[PDB]
Amino acid sequence: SLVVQEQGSFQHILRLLNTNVDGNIKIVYALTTIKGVGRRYSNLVCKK
Amino acid sequence: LVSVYDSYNPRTILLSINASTHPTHVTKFHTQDNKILATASDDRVTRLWDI
Amino acid sequence: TATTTGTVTVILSQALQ
């Protein structure tokens, strides 16, 4: 019965540029859900 | 959902015990026996499962 | 109310516990 901090709040399904990208999948395979983006573009975007 | 994979192979989920609808917070096999798995959950009840 | 200082004795007490 002691306070333990929660490391951030999990925000479920996100709107991003007319796309409802889901908050339960990984970030790279989530960014490829938008129309007109591939896997290389996705992990390049996350790398920079 | 207790899920038991085999170690050193993350792609073969061996069986998915569907325990309580509450979160299952502790899962450990027996230390003497091999084929029983004890899972306690936020259901205030632990369960022994034969795998 | 306080009138003594701002000390450090809670720190010291749960250093020595």
Partner: protein
């Protein structure tokens, strides 16, 4: 039967075939299991002991070792042969939630 650790327990491990150690709250207690009875309690922390684990027979001056992790930064090692006295400890950069050894 039931063993009344007064604080909400966070972990229970078994040291001997007879005695088990429960941590919860600022202390940990050890319980003889053939006699249903508490026999040591160490409260050498500031915040709640989150976890325990135990080592036996490994290459060490200590023949047995119970280490304990306690939400204030500290993990400490207690020697079960001289009355669960603390022998060494580490301080970490935040509240330590779980610990283990080889």
């Amino acid at each position: 039967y039931s063993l009344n650790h007064d604080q909400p327990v966070e972990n229970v491990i078994a040291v001997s075939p007879t005695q088990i150690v429960s941590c919860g709250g600022n202390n940990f207690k050890v319980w003889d299991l053939t006699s249903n009875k508490k026999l040591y309690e160490r409260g050498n922390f500031n915040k709640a002991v989150t976890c325990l684990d135990y080592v036996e027979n490994f290459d060490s001056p200590m023949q047995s070792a119970l280490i304990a992790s306690s939400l204030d930064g500290h993990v400490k090692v207690f020697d079960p042969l001289d009355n669960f006295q603390v022998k060494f400890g580490w301080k970490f950069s935040g509240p330590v939630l779980s610990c283990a050894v080889s």
